C-alpha cells in the first residue's frame, strides 16, 4: 500500500474535526439539544434564548463535510482522524434516535 501525503485541505480538515469535538461536543451541548427538541427552555442571562439545535446542525454539517474529505485517503494520520469524525457523529445520533417517540 502506497502511503500518501496530505493536501492543505486534509490537514485543515483534521484540525477542524479535533477542535469541533473539544469545543462543541461537550456534554452540556447534548443536554441542551434534547431540552430544545421538546421545547422546555434553557434561557440566557437576562433575556433571549440559546439555540442549541442550530449549533448541533452546524456541528453535524461540519463533521460530515470534514469526514468526506478524509474518507478515501490512505495516510494513517488521516484515517485515524476519520475515525474521530465517524465516532463523534455516532455519539450524536445515538442521543437523537428514537427521542420523543
Amino acid at each position: 500500500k502506497t502511503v500518501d501525503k496530505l493536501n492543505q485541505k486534509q490537514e485543515s480538515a483534521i484540525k477542524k474535526i479535533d477542535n469541533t469535538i473539544k469545543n462543541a461536543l461537550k456534554d452540556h451541548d447534548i443536554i441542551g439539544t434534547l431540552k430544545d427538541m421538546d421545547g422546555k427552555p434553557v434561557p440566557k442571562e437576562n433575556g433571549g434564548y440559546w439555540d442549541a439545535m442550530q449549533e448541533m446542525q452546524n456541528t453535524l454539517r461540519g463533521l460530515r463535510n470534514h469526514a468526506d474529505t478524509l474518507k478515501n485517503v490512505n495516510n494513517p494520520e488521516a484515517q485515524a482522524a476519520y475515525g474521530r469524525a465517524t465516532d463523534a457523529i455516532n455519539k450524536i445520533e445515538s442521543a437523537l434516535k428514537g427521542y420523543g417517540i
Binding site: 456534554d27 447534548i30 443536554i31 439539544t33 434534547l34 431540552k35 430544545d36 427538541m37 421538546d38 421545547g39 422546555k40 427552555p41 439545535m53 448541533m56 446542525q57 453535524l60 460530515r64 445520533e93 445515538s94 442521543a95 437523537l96 434516535k97 428514537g98 427521542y99 420523543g100 417517540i101
Partner: protein, 313 residues
C-alpha cells in the same frame, strides 16, 4: 348496552372533522387525541399488551419494560394500570418534572438514565433490566413489534373507510414508528382493494431519512422540533413499498399550522398534528389534488405540550 370492563378497551372510534378554514374544505382531520390517554399511542399500548397476553408471554409475575421518552410511556402506563401489570420506563434525565409526575401518579417505575447518552443510554439500560431476570421482564420493542401496525389495520383503517364511505383518495400521516401509515395502507390497499390510494408520509426537513432511504442515499439524521415523528432511522413497522410520497416540513411551519388549527378550528393540536396538515396544504398547491378527499392524522393534543414553545406568551 356497552359497559367497558377496563379503560384499555375504550380505544378508537375518533371523529373525522372537516377543516373549513385550513384548505378548501377537502381536508378531513382524524382527531387521535380522543383516546384514554389522549394520543395515537393508546391504540398500541393496548394491543401490544393484548398480543402479549394471547401468546402467553405475559403471565402473572411478568413485568413490563420499555425505553421511551414520548407518548408511548403514558400509553403503556394506563394499560398496565388498567389490566393490572407492573411497568418500568427507562428514559433520560432531560425530561421535565411535570412529565414524570404524570407517569409516577399513574403507576410507573421510572429509571432515569444520564442525559449525555440520550436515548441509547435509555435503551441499553432496558436490556440490563431484562438480562437481570429474563423470565420475569418483558420488552415490548415498539419499533419492531407487529402488534403496532396490526391495531391500525383492525381499528383506524376501517374507521376512515366507513366515515368516508370509501371516498378517501389521499391519506397523510407522520411517521415516528410507522405503524399508523402501514396499517391504514394495508387495510385500504390490501383488504379493501383500492390500489389508487396515495399514502403520504411526513418527516422533518432537519431529519429527512425516509426521502434518503427511497433515493438510495446514506442516512442523515439530525435534531428537529416536530416531536412525535422523525425517528432518525427506518423502523421495521414502516413499509416503504406503500409510501407513495413523502413531504418534509420545517419547524416553523409546523408550529405555525398548529396555532392555526387551535385558533381557527378549535382543535387542540400538537406540533406533529400541524406538521401533517401543512403537508396537505403543500400537496393541494398542486392542481391535481383539488378534488381529492384528504385524511390527515392529528396525533396529539396541545395541552400536553403547554410548557413548550408552541405557546409563545
Amino acid at each position: 348496552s356497552k359497559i367497558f370492563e377496563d379503560n384499555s378497551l375504550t380505544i378508537g372510534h375518533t371523529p373525522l372533522v372537516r377543516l373549513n378554514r385550513i384548505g378548501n374544505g377537502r381536508i378531513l382531520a382524524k382527531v387521535e387525541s380522543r383516546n384514554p390517554s389522549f394520543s395515537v399511542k393508546c391504540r398500541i399500548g393496548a394491543n401490544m399488551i393484548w398480543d402479549a397476553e394471547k401468546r402467553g408471554v405475559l403471565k402473572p409475575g411478568v413485568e413490563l419494560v420499555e425505553p421511551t421518552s414520548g407518548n408511548t410511556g403514558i400509553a403503556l402506563a394506563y394499560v398496565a394500570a388498567a389490566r393490572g401489570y407492573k411497568l418500568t420506563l427507562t428514559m433520560p434525565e432531560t425530561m421535565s418534572i411535570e412529565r414524570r409526575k404524570l407517569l409516577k401518579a399513574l403507576g410507573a417505575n421510572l429509571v432515569l438514565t444520564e442525559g449525555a447518552k440520550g436515548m441509547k443510554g435509555a435503551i441499553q439500560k432496558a436490556e440490563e433490566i431484562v438480562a437481570s431476570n429474563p423470565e420475569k421482564y418483558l420488552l415490548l420493542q415498539q419499533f419492531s413489534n407487529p402488534a403496532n401496525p396490526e391495531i391500525h389495520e383492525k381499528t383506524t383503517g376501517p374507521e376512515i373507510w366507513e366515515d368516508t364511505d370509501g371516498q378517501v383518495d389521499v391519506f397523510i400521516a407522520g411517521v415516528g414508528t410507522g405503524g399508523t401509515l402501514t396499517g391504514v395502507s394495508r387495510y385500504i390497499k390490501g383488504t379493501k382493494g383500492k390500489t389508487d390510494l396515495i399514502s403520504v408520509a411526513v418527516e422533518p426537513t432537519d431529519s429527512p431519512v425516509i426521502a434518503q432511504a427511497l433515493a438510495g442515499e446514506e442516512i442523515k439524521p439530525g435534531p428537529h422540533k416536530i416531536q412525535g415523528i422523525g425517528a432518525g432511522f427506518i423502523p421495521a413497522n414502516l413499509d416503504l413499498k406503500l409510501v407513495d410520497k413523502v413531504i418534509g416540513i420545517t419547524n416553523e411551519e409546523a408550529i405555525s399550522t398548529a396555532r392555526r388549527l387551535m385558533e381557527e378550528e378549535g382543535i387542540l393540536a400538537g406540533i406533529s398534528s400541524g406538521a401533517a396538515v401543512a403537508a396537505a396544504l403543500k400537496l393541494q398547491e398542486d392542481e391535481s389534488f383539488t378534488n381529492k378527499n384528504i385524511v390527515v392524522i392529528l396525533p396529539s393534543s396541545g395541552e400536553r405540550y403547554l410548557s413548550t414553545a408552541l405557546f409563545a406568551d
